[PDB]
Amino acid sequence: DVPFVQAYSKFADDNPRHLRVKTGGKMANALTNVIRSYYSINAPAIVPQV
Amino acid sequence: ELIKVPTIPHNLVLIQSDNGKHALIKEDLGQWPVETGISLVNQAGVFAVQLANKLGIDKPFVLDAGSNYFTDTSFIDTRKYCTDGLSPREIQKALNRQRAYYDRPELTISENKTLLSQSIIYPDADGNDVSIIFSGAMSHAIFTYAQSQWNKNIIKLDDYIREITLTVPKQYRPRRFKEIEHTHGYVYRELNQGSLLPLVDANLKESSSYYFKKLMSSISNVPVDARTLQSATAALAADTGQAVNRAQHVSMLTNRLTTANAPTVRAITVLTCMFKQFRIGMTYALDPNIMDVAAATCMLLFRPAQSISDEQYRYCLQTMAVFLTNTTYDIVNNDTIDVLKMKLRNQGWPFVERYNAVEIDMSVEPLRSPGQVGRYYNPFNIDPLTKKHVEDRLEEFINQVQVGRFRNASGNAVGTTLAAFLRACRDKTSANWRGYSVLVSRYRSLIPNELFESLRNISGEYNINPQDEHSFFFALAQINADDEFIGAIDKESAEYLDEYATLARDISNSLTLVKAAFGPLERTSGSIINHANNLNKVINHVFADKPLISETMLKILTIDGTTGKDGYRNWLDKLVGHNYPVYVEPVVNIMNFISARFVADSSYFGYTNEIMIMPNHINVPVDDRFGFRDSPFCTSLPRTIMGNDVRRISYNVFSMMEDIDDVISEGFILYDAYFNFSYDIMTTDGVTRLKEDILIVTDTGNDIKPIHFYIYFENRNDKKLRYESKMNVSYRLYIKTPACLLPLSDYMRAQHDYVSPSSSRVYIKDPAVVYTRS
Amino acid sequence: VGRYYNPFNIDPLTKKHVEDRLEEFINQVQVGRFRNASGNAVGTTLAAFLR
Amino acid sequence: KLFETSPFDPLTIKNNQDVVDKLYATQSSSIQEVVPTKTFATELQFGVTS
């Protein structure tokens, strides 16, 4: 599992855990939110610039 | 051999405040520096070995903690109280001090008995002893995993014997084991067989030359019967009339006889019949004589057809045609084998054919060749079933040579000389083939099947002189198997077995090193330069201190005159991109486990991936379980503070920041780096602070100074320390709470189980099942 | 940016000489006979140099 | 007397290994089916070390 741990840590800024659901971290949330914003002008677009 | 570990390596310590209000259990596994910018997994590998040595699990072992117990004075209590791990009396003392602070009554007798009986030893169904003790979580996980890995190689003696029955020769007296050993005997053996092909296939000339030289030295010392040549020479002189006055072809054969190189040739004879394809060469004189023809005929008749190449076979036929048929080398230069065979047969010469030796199967399975059948060639091309030459018409062919007319239309001087010589060689080979067959079989048992089918006479060092060949068969010596010689072979078998086992380990080590260190090459200068530098760095490190590879490998690699470092560097180079399967050993499994936990649980080993710097006026949730004053530990680094997400900056960006003063006012999280930290827990009360300033600003970049927490326990109603914390400290550094810390209230989480094997088991150091005959 | 020939006709990808029958070719020279009437051990001497 | 030399003194032993060790020490007194000599081995594999 060593190659997967490195890839997940880079993507999610946290080590994978057996008892925590693998969600992708804050990058996954930001990617999901920008997709909503691109589709329509009425989307919230709440992701900070920082 | 196997090591019996007497005590379980618990790593628990008890820290309690002076007033006794707060107490904690901490597992101390050491602090290991971690460097950023390079792979963490590679660093974890170095620390895994050091950690294994600290716990005592690096070498094969079995736990022997069954006898560490005592029995209570009460007559009802028949339980066995374990003495390993953290003492339950230490927890009882800590718990009573806590109750004294709160003015609660001390632990009752019933409560004391339950606490004092937590650590026990009880037997299981299989006779093993199970120890329940207080110990660290990672110490328990790593120690128990290493136990299961080493136990894979511990088997009963009867199981080991059944796996090695097929390799036991008949000429050895069986060993009588004691009755206890048959019932309760166990052996630690690694039964995986590693191939020697990676060394042999890559370096064929070096491997073949090394083993041929070692074998030749042994065979050269075999005793032989001392039989004079006078009887053989006198018979030859009578059959072909030899006159002192006249010059005859028979004299040229006789004056050239010599037994000086007989031990060397007879070792070549064994080598031809011991290996699948051992090809020998032979160079004749520029002007062939009757000796060359006799030598060439002897080679074709009494040597295996597998030892004679087609080019050598044609060269032998060309030499006969030049002498017997009165032609030149230039004429027969372009003639093929079939054409040459017709020329000699028309003149009356029938010895123009190679003969295949008959294979004989070994009685037992060859060493390092599981589930395989060995073979070797019978010497002198004699069929063992018929006890005569493969050619059934050899008597008729010799008579045909006798009446033939070669080199002269009138007379039979050449034919009679060759026929009489060839009859002598036939008789000697018939009488003495059994001794050579036994000699070949004995040396065949030394080599595995891989060496039997792979080694070749590439260099051509072992070439037989024509004078030595014809004198070998004319003056063949019977083989005498002295008792001293027999014992010498038994010593060689032990040394050969150790050498093969050593080589297998070195090959497995080298194959692991190549995969981890070197990638694939590209047709670019950068790839070639990178590979060359990395190759030199690895070679310098492996040969430093005690060399990784043994002296046996270095002897094979240096057989051509190259240095040991140079020979290893070339062989490692060829191994890049190998598809050879490497069996994973128990020690590799253990190290990968500790490496995985080092990456997964970083707080145990003193480093973390994230730190937070926040102003003092901002209130953050903290871990209040331990009663620390101004605790620098958070259960998790907060996602939001005051309704806004905490800003996260990578260490590289923070290093290059020139507006760092504006950023620190708000607070931020630092990540993308490994932060080494240390802490000290003081029993008194005081201001919790850091040893050094948090950050250092330079014209080149910003950096974080080494982290060392001074942590004190908290007395809430202390105005002096409360004011100093708020006013004398402006910024605070937070990290996730280390997982090694555990409150005293949760002391039942430290209970863990260790299983030790039965004490009835006896371990056998020498599991071999045979003795020497004498 | 430039390009150059790798020395000694060695392919970095295969880490070996370009000719894939070199070992067979050298063995052929070792067992060969070239000047039987006027030469001695020409094939063996030349083969040893090649290895 | 049942034995000229006792196979082992029971009071000296402590576990199963001492019985085996003592039996090897006193085996010369008994009539042995096979008299021990140097031992011959047919299999030997060395494992990789730490």
- CB distance B279 to B456 below 8 Å: yes
- The owner of tokens 């030394």 is B446
Angle made by CA atoms C35, C40, C43, in degrees to the nearest 5: 70
Distance separating alpha carbons of residues D15 and D12, to the nearest angstrom? 10
Q: What token pair was written down for B128? A: 């093993």
CA angle B18, B23, B29 (to 5 degrees): 115
DSSP for B379-437, written as a single string: GGGEETTTTEES-TTHHHHHHHHHH---S-SS--HHHHHHHHHHHHHHHHHHHHHHHHH
Pairing of strands B741-743, B644-645: unpaired
Q: Which residue of C has its CA nearest to B578?
A: C14
- Token pair listed for B221: 């010392």
Tokens representing B707 are 């982290």
Signed CA dihedral, B2, B5, B8, B13: sign only:
negative
CB-defined contacts B:C, below 8 A: 42
In this structure, what are the phi and psi dihedrals at residue B80, rounded to the nearest 5 degrees? -100, 120
Contact B632, B611 (CB under 8 A): no
Q: State how far residue D10 is from chain B, nearest Cα, in angstroms.
A: 15
- Counting other chains too, the contacts that B54-60 makes at CB distance below 8 Å and 24 or more residues apart are B54/B29, B54/B30, B55/B9, B55/B139, B55/B142, B55/B143, B55/B146, B56/B5, B56/B9, B57/B142, B57/B143, B57/B146, B57/B590, B58/B587, B58/D50, B59/B3, B59/D49, B59/D50, B60/B2, B60/B3, B60/B150, B60/B153, B60/B188, B60/B586
Strand partners, B703: B696
The CA radius of gyration of chain A, in Å to the nearest whole number, is 14
**DSSP string spanning A13-42?**
SS---TTS----HHHHHHHHHHHHHHH-TT
Q: Within 13 Å and on the Cβ side, how many CA atoms surround B710?
A: 10
CA–CA distance, B54 with B576 (Å, rounded to integer): 34
Instruction: Give the closest residue to B298 by CA, choosing from B381, B238, B230, B236.
Output: B381
Tokens of B424: 């002598």
| Collapsed DSSP state (helix, strand, coil) of residue C49 | helix
- DSSP string across B131-149: EEEE--HHHHHHHHHHHHH
Which residue does chain B place closest to A16, by CA atoms? B600
Cβ–Cβ below 8 Å for B181 and D20: yes
For helices A25-39 and A2-12, angle between their N-to-C axes, nearest 10 degrees: 50
Least Cα separation, residue B188 to chain A (angstroms): 30
Residue B747 and residue B134 in contact, taking contact as beta carbons nearer than 8 Å: yes
Round to whole Å and give the CA distance between B20 and C38. 105
Q: How far is CA B514 from the centre of its chain?
A: 14
Question: How many CA within 13 A on the CB side of residue B231?
Answer: 7
Q: Tell if the CB–CB gap between A1 and B599 is shorter than 8 Å.
A: no
Whose CA is closest to B571, among B513, B496, B525, B523? B513
Token readout for A2 is 């060593």
Torsion-angle region of residue B542: left (phi > 0), alpha (psi -120 to 50) or beta? Answer: alpha
Which residues in A1-39 are b (16+ Cβ under 10 Å) and which e?
Answer: eeeebeebbeebbbeeeeeeeeeeebeeeeeeeeeeeee
Place of tokens 């008299």: D35
The DSSP secondary-structure symbol of C46 reads H
What is the interface size between A and B, counted as CB pairs within 8 Å? 18
Report which residue type is found at D29: S
List of long-range contacts for B696-705, beta carbons under 8 Å, 24+ apart: B697/B660, B701/B655, B701/B656, B702/B654, B702/B655, B702/B656, B702/B657, B702/B660, B703/B655, B704/B611, B704/B651, B704/B670, B704/B675
Phi, psi of B15 (to 5 degrees): -120, 125
| β-sheet bridge partners, residue B682 | B712
Geometric angle at alpha carbon D20, from D15 and D23, rounded to 5°: 125
Which residues make beta-bridge pairs with B463? B281
Distance CA B572, CA B570 (A): 6
Q: Which of B85, B57, B24, B221 is nearest to B151 (CA)?
A: B57
**Bridge partners (DSSP) listed for residue B70:** B81
Torsion angle, alpha carbons of B142, B145, B146, B151, to 10: 160
Work out the number of other CB atoms within 10 angstroms of the CB of residue B655. 16
Under an 8 A CB cutoff, do A15 and B600 touch?
Answer: yes
**Burial of B573 per CB tally in 10 Å (0-12, 13-18, 19+):** middle
SS3 assignment, position B350: coil
SS3 for B351? coil
Neighbours of chain A (3+ CB pairs under 8 A): B
- The helix/strand/coil state of B676 is strand
CA–centroid distance for B158 within its chain: 26
Residue with tokens 């050094």: B692
Q: Of B599, B602, B639, B669, which to mutate for an interface test with A (greatest number of A Cβ within 10 Å)?
A: B599
Is the backbone of residue B577 left (phi > 0), alpha (psi -120 to 50) or beta?
A: left
Three-class secondary structure assignment of B646-670 = CCEEEHHHHHHCCCHHHHHHHCEEE
Nearest residue to B239 via CA among B411, B421, B406 = B421
Whole-angstrom CA distances from B529 to B508, B534, B536, B537 are 27, 9, 11, 13
Annotate B484-539 with three-state secondary structure. HHHHHHHHHHHHHHHHHHHHHHHHHHHHHHHHHHCCCCCCCHHHHHHHHHHHHHHH
Indicate the burial class of B391 (C-beta count within 10 angstroms; 0-12, 13-18, 19 or more): middle
Best C1, C28, C31 member to test B by mutation, with max B CBs in 10 Å, is C31
**Long-range contacts of residues B245-253, Cβ cutoff 8 Å, at least 24 apart:** B248/B413, B248/B417, B249/B290, B249/B413, B249/B414, B249/B417, B250/B417, B250/B420, B252/B289, B252/B290, B252/B291, B253/B290, B253/B291, B253/B294, B253/B417, B253/B421, B253/B470
As given in the structure block, the two tokens for residue B151 are 């136990």
The helix (run of H) or strand (run of E) holding residue B193 is: none
CA distance B592 to A5: 14
Contact D50 B504 (CB under 8 A): no
Alpha-carbon distance B248 to B639, whole Å?
Answer: 111
Q: Which residues of B71-92 are buried (b: 16+ CB within 10 A; e: fewer)?
A: eeeeeeeeebbbbbbbbbeebb
Helix (H) / strand (E) element for B153: namely none
What SS3 class is residue D49?
coil
Which residue do the tokens 């708020």 mark? B726
